[PDB]
Ligand binder design. Structure first.
Ligand SMILES: Cc1cn([C@H]2C[C@H](OP(=O)(O)O)[C@@H](COP(=O)(O)O)O2)c(=O)[nH]c1=O
Ligand SMILES: [Ca+2]
Length: 135
């Protein structure tokens, strides 16, 4: 896979961020995970929703460098969002959320599953530690 640079435009929520990519603003959705929704229609927030959102917003707004890494299949979803692994100063945001119990490994669609193992191990560790959502 290969990492390419991108620039933060804005964090939307725990798993969705807007970036300027190759000079065009696009919304990206983090591959392989799912954070709790905060703007569920009328609902206004699932437990850990707000928590997942600030974590991601904090990681990306404080980075010196952001990089996106596409997997091997489809690079956009049916909503037109780019599907990638996002790295903030070389730290993968997708894994950081899972490791904290603020996301679960979800939407696993072959062939975009290069880091599925890696993420599954971090989830196991967050479950074995009873963090956030596994609390
Ligand atoms: C991460 C991911 C989500 N999606 C789809 C599945 C879900 O569609 P539906 O809206 O049909 O449920 C939705 C999950 O997105 P959100 O978690 O942002 O809702 O996006 C993909 O199509 N491929 C992906 O890899
Ligand atoms: Ca979500």
């Amino acid at each position: 896979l290969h990492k390419e640079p991108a620039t933060l435009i804005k964090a939307i929520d725990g798993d969705t961020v807007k970036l300027m990519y190759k000079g065009q603003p696009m919304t990206f959705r983090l591959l392989l995970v799912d954070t709790p929704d905060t703007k569920h229609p009328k609902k206004g927030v699932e437990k850990y929703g707000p928590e997942a959102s600030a974590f991601t917003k904090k990681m990306v707004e404080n980075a010196k460098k952001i990089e996106v890494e596409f997997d091997k299949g489809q690079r956009t979803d049916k909503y037109g969002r780019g599907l990638a692994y996002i790295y903030a100063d070389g730290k993968m945001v997708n894994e950081a959320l899972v490791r904290q119990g603020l996301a679960k490994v979800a939407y696993v669609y072959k062939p975009n599953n290069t880091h599925e193992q890696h993420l599954r191990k971090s989830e196991a560790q967050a479950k074995k530690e009873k963090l956030n959502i596994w609390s």
